[PDB]
Write an enzyme that holds these catalytic residues in place. Structure first.
Site, PDB file in Angstrom:
ATOM      1  N   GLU A   1      19.226 -14.420 -19.673  1.00 52.35           N
ATOM      2  CA  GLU A   1      20.077 -15.394 -20.359  1.00 52.35           C
ATOM      3  C   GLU A   1      21.259 -15.779 -19.472  1.00 52.35           C
ATOM      4  O   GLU A   1      21.616 -16.953 -19.370  1.00 52.35           O
ATOM      5  CB  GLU A   1      20.615 -14.843 -21.665  1.00 52.35           C
ATOM      6  CG  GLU A   1      21.478 -15.850 -22.386  1.00 52.35           C
ATOM      7  CD  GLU A   1      22.185 -15.289 -23.598  1.00 52.35           C
ATOM      8  OE1 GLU A   1      21.536 -14.599 -24.413  1.00 52.35           O
ATOM      9  OE2 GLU A   1      23.395 -15.576 -23.747  1.00 52.35           O
ATOM     10  N   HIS A   2      21.824 -14.803 -18.777  1.00 52.03           N
ATOM     11  CA  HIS A   2      22.962 -15.087 -17.929  1.00 52.03           C
ATOM     12  C   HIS A   2      22.632 -15.963 -16.743  1.00 52.03           C
ATOM     13  O   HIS A   2      23.520 -16.581 -16.151  1.00 52.03           O
ATOM     14  CB  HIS A   2      23.572 -13.810 -17.435  1.00 52.03           C
ATOM     15  CG  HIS A   2      24.505 -13.190 -18.406  1.00 52.03           C
ATOM     16  ND1 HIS A   2      25.868 -13.183 -18.213  1.00 52.03           N
ATOM     17  CD2 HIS A   2      24.284 -12.593 -19.602  1.00 52.03           C
ATOM     18  CE1 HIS A   2      26.447 -12.592 -19.238  1.00 52.03           C
ATOM     19  NE2 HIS A   2      25.510 -12.230 -20.098  1.00 52.03           N
TER      20      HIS A   2
ATOM     21  N   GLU B   1      31.306  -7.886 -19.879  1.00 55.70           N
ATOM     22  CA  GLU B   1      30.945  -8.095 -21.286  1.00 55.70           C
ATOM     23  C   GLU B   1      30.783  -6.810 -22.064  1.00 55.70           C
ATOM     24  O   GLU B   1      31.256  -6.691 -23.205  1.00 55.70           O
ATOM     25  CB  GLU B   1      29.708  -8.984 -21.419  1.00 55.70           C
ATOM     26  CG  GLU B   1      30.074 -10.455 -21.311  1.00 55.70           C
ATOM     27  CD  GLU B   1      28.896 -11.348 -21.027  1.00 55.70           C
ATOM     28  OE1 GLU B   1      29.122 -12.473 -20.526  1.00 55.70           O
ATOM     29  OE2 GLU B   1      27.749 -10.939 -21.311  1.00 55.70           O
TER      30      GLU B   1
END
Lengths: 423, 51, 60, 446, 105
Positions: free
Chosen positions: D60-61, D137
């Site tokens: 996703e990143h 994160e």
């Protein structure tokens, strides 16, 4: 193949009230009563009154006790919410369509027959403190409240939240008075989603014929300027820099709205570089590490604030603010493209369309329009309106911000945060 | 003034606890019977005829 | 048959503290008796010092 | 005027189509000038092994950071420039990438989505830049008690299964994951019959189909065959994980029993009982007069700052319970009341309250399916989990069928005398002992 | 209206004087037995009444202590007897019964 849609129906009763309804054949219904009763209507002797009011949407009324309002609404799985801005209060109610009559009744009661009983009001005061504490835990809120208190000397300087010294001091008589002089026909609009025009208009003519308040959407916001600073230690310094811009609905307002998208507002891509954001690229260049920047644009009935908002490390405040300002300066000096104003345009237009995609947003746009313009402007003509913004108008908006008296609010470790004086 | 407990819900509540209250009486019956070796009752039970 | 035993036993008789109790009381009845049989029968087998004395001295 | 019932029949039927591929292209046309299009993939973290763990989250990143045709930064420039919004998410079983866009932009919107979905240019410089980001994160995620407690709850409830794992992965995997590791995950997972192209708004299903064939043509065509596993069921354990930390000022607690999972019809009734218990937050207007006894007692005696019931669905299993936030001296009381309500509902749900719960659900469902995004997400998820798209009319029918008997029957099956999975974080000195939490899962009168 | 009303009224005025709380400077509502409904109504009284009510009761307890009574002049005349608490209590009862009706459905 959906059925062809309905058209919104709009009506101005001669007493000032506005009614607007759309029959989206939705399984649910949204009814909202919008009133020009926002915080700008409080004065120095009654601050926070409209907050306590905002929180008392379920105290007993005539014809509906607190317990009944609560139980009655939850019995059908309905909702009663009150939402405020410095200009309006907006009581909205929602439920499946077979239940609008019971929810409509409750709404009418909360807005037109509140009793504000001493002991229920006293029991409710502590909620101001809880309610304020929860909001103020986002640094932005203190900032924007200081921003406004610094920018105006009047009305718009009032905060959405009760001053601490007033918590526990607002009186039931003050609540009575606030409702009597602000919740009147001429300062009200009744928006309906999933209901029918005749029902709304019937309701309006039966229950919303109340007049004996004041008149205009103004004490009149005097713009002032100056700034407010709150030392904190939050690691991140929060700051907003603004100037008087344009009143909502005026053509200059759309120039500011477009300028906002040229400079850059929210992100469009999950974790992006924010390539199309003039501000974010301009600060990046001179700043390497944690920060956010955004153009800021608030527009009111008789004024408006435009500028930008920065979040940066305590030591980078100066640099982030300075770079961000310089980048606006650049657009003011005429260095603005054409495919830029275009992209901004497309970000604005699309954003608007998306903003009224749901019911919650459609009803609020309709409600606020009714209150600010006394009309309903369709999407196609709003798009036409944005489309008529010319490159020079955007440049002029930029120009107005640069040369106008400023307003700054900032909180955090301010040791490296510029003063205005020094911008 | 026991009218406060008279309505539909209360009636549903009573039905819901009926099997339980019945079974709790079954426990008390057998319970006394077994504990006093109830001559009268126990004679009917096969295998518990210790006479 | 084996897992379903403890299972069925739980299903039909154990959840409801009602039945759970109904069974232990009912289970105490049968048990008290069956224990007193075997127990006495055991006491006898290791002995036989009284009772069969009766068959002798009386019977009239 | 049109009744509620009637209004449900008015909702246009979701249109389904399949590419000679396995790609299901589904849509729901409306008259809106705006839409949401996207790809819902059957990729999660429940699909990853202990060392791949964090793979999807890593992808996703990288997803929007460059494709082969759209390098480094251009994809953003395109989305941003047309005023569209590009977003993405990953849970333990699902992954999505969707764009909010003007209806006319549907072509490019799709063309872009495809590019992201197949040609992900996982350039080393970036795969490397992302690792310092994802690590960051994790550091912030650690400050969200709530996020930590549900991670804990999963960790213990699903001890030893893949469902025990978190989405983001452990730090060691974040720093060691190779490009090979990612490349493999995509190939193993991002393949046609496991992904749905969905959309909602002002579009015609034909258009959608044209596009699906146009830019998604050429995935599982010359593919299928060997190396495609199914998911193994996950053992629910029923245990406790207490992370004691008196430095935090409010305790977070999350208790749940094992839920049936996505497909089970039992979910509707479960959702109605939950609705009866509901939620609470200290900013709720109306405290003492609230319908839910939990909420009302909670509000009256200030037994918490917030609580929420939930029903997290996974294939064949799930978490069914409630979460709450409270002062150190209120954990016991809160636990007692919550359990009291489950028991009550198990043994004595009255008829009146079940209608409330039902009404709450109809209002939640219909209120939730409002705006293109939520609907597109419902189309995409539904196809991945039901294989069909369940028309509101049917959910109503299902809700309608629930009455009190059903509630106390269905609640008993899952709650009555069952072992909870308990997760505690904060100042939990007074979190009741497990034995006692377990004893509160049945009652002696019943 | 006529002889009839006056008779009942005078029967009432007679009991009142016989009940005799007025001798302790009390008022009918001061002697009310405190239960849940009553506690709440006492709670809802505005500052002034609540203060007066406490002083009245204190005056009485003090008398009932030394078993004296007030001079005749200062007894509380029937008529002149304010049912200050009544409206509050009625509303508290009226509220409860609503919950009670709601609890039946």
């Amino acid at each position: 193949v959906p059925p062809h849609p309905q058209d919104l129906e709009f009506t101005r009763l001669p007493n000032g009230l506005v009614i607007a309804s759309l029959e989206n054949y939705a399984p649910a219904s949204r009814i909202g009563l919008f009133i020009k009763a926002g915080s700008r209507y409080e004065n120095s002797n009654n601050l926070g009154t409209s907050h306590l009011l905002r929180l008392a949407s379920s105290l007993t009324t005539k014809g509906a006790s607190s317990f009944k309002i609560t139980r009655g609404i939850e019995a059908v799985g309905g909702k009663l919410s009150v939402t405020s801005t410095r200009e309006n209060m907006a009581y909205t109610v929602e439920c499946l369509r077979d239940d609008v009559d019971i929810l409509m009744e409750f709404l009418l009661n909360v807005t037109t027959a509140p009793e504000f009983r001493r002991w229920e009001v006293a029991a409710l005061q502590p909620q101001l403190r809880i309610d304020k504490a929860v909001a103020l835990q986002n640094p932005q809120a203190h900032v924007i409240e200081n921003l406004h208190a610094a920018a105006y000397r009047n009305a718009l300087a009032n905060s959405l939240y009760c001053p601490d010294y007033r918590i526990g001091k607002v009186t039931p008589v003050e609540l009575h008075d606030y409702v009597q002089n602000h919740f009147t026909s001429a300062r009200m609009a009744l928006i309906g989603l999933g209901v029918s025009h005749p029902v709304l208009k019937q309701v309006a003519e039966q229950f919303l014929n109340i007049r004996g308040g004041l008149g205009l959407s103004g004490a009149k916001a005097k713009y002032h300027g100056g700034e407010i600073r709150e030392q904190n230690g939050d690691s991140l310094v929060h700051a907003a820099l603004v100037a008087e811009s344009a009143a909502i609905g005026s053509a200059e307002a759309n120039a500011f709205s477009v300028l906002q998208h040229v400079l850059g507002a929210g992100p469009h891509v999950k974790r992006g570089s924010n390539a199309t954001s003039s501000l974010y690229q301009a600060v990046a260049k001179g700043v390497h590490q944690p920060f956010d920047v955004s153009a800021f644009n608030a527009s009111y009935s008789d004024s408006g604030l435009f500028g930008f908002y920065t979040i940066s490390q305590a030591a980078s405040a100066g640099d982030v603010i300075k770079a961000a300002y310089n980048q606006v300066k650049t657009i003011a000096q005429g260095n603005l493209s054409n495919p830029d104003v275009q992209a901004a345009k497309n970000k604005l237009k699309a954003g608007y369309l998306m903003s009224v995609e749901s019911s919650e947003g459609f009803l609020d746009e309709v409600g606020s329009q009714a209150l600010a313009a006394g009309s309903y402007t369709p999407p196609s003509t709003v798009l036409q309106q944005i489309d008529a913004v010319a490159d020079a108008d955007v440049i002029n908006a930029a120009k107005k911000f640069v040369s106008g008296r400023k307003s700054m609010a900032a909180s955090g470790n301010l040791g490296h945060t510029p003063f205005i004086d020094e911008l | 003034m026991l009218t406060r407990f008279l309505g539909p819900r209360y009636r549903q509540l009573a039905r819901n606890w009926v099997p339980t209250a019945q079974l709790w009486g079954a426990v008390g019956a057998v319970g006394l019977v077994w504990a006093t070796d109830w001559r009268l009752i126990l004679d009917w039970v096969p295998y518990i005829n210790g006479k | 048959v084996a897992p379903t035993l403890t299972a069925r036993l739980y299903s039909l008789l154990f959840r409801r503290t009602s039945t759970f109790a109904l069974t232990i009381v009912v289970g105490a009845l049968f048990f008290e008796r069956a224990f007193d049989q075997g127990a006495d029968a055991i006491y006898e087998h290791i002995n036989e010092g009284k009772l069969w004395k009766h068959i002798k001295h009386k019977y009239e | 005027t049109a009744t509620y019932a009637q209004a449900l029949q008015s909702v246009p039927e979701t249109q389904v189509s399949q590419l000679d591929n396995g790609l299901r292209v589904a849509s729901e046309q409306s008259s809106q000038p705006t839409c949401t299009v996207g790809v819902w993939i059957d990729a999660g973290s429940r699909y990853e092994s202990e060392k791949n763990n964090g793979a999807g989250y890593f992808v996703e990143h990288l997803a929007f950071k460059g494709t082969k045709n759209r390098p480094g930064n251009a994809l953003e420039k395109e989305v941003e420039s047309m005023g569209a919004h590009l977003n993405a998410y990953s849970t333990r079983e699902h992954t999505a990438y969707y764009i909010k866009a003007l209806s006319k932009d549907l072509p490019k919107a799709v063309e872009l989505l495809a590019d992201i979905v197949q040609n992900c240019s996982l350039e080393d410089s970036q795969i490397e830049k992302e690792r310092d980001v994802i690590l960051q994160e994790l550091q912030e995620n650690d400050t969200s008690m709530r996020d930590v407690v549900f991670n804990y709850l999963h960790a213990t409830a699903f001890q030893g299964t893949p469902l025990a794992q978190s989405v983001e992965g452990p730090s060691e995997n974040v720093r060691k994951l190779s490009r090979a590791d990612l490349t493999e995950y995509l190939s193993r997972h991002y393949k046609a019959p496991r992904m749905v192209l969905a959309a909602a708004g002002g579009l015609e299903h034909r258009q959608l189909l044209d596009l699906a064939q146009k830019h998604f043509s050429g995935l599982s065509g010359t593919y299928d065959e060997d190396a495609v596993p199914t998911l193994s069921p996950c053992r629910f354990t029923g245990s406790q994980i207490c992370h004691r930390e008196d430095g935090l000022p409010l305790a977070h607690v999350a208790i749940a029993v094992e839920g049936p999972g996505w497909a089970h019809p039992d979910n509707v009734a479960l959702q109605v009982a939950n609705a009866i218990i509901g939620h609470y937050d200290c900013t709720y207007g109306g405290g003492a007069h609230l319908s839910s006894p939990l909420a009302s007692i909670a509000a009256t005696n200030k037994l918490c700052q917030s609580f929420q019931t939930f029903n997290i669905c996974y294939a064949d299993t799930g978490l069914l319970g409630a979460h709450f936030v409270c002062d150190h001296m209120s954990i016991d009381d809160m636990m007692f009341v919550l359990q009291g309500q489950w028991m009550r509902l198990c043994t004595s749900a009255t008829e009146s309250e079940v209608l409330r719960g039902k009404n709450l659900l109809r209002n939640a469902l219909v209120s939730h399916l409002d705006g293109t995004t939520p609907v597109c997400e419902d189309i995409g998820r539904s196809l991945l989990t039901y294989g069909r798209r369940i028309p509101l009319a049917e959910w109503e029918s299902r809700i309608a069928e629930v009455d009190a008997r059903v509630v106390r029957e269905v609640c008993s099956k899952y709650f009555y005398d069952q072992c909870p999975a308990v997760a505690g974080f904060g100042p939990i000195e007074q979190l009741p002992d497990y034995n006692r939490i377990r004893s509160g899962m049945f009652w002696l009168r019943f | 209206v006529s002889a009839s009303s006056r008779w009942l009224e005078g029967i009432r005025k007679w009991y009142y004087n016989a009940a005799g709380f007025n001798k302790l400077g009390l008022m009918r509502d001061d002697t009310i037995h405190e239960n849940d409904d009553v506690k709440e109504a006492i709670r809802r009284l505005p500052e002034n009444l609540y203060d007066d009510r406490v002083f009245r009761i204190k005056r009485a307890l003090d008398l009932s202590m030394r078993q004296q009574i007030l001079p005749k002049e200062q007894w509380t005349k029937y008529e002149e007897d304010k049912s200050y608490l009544e409206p509050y209590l009625k509303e508290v009862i009226r509220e409860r019964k609503e919950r009670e009706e709601w609890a039946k459905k």
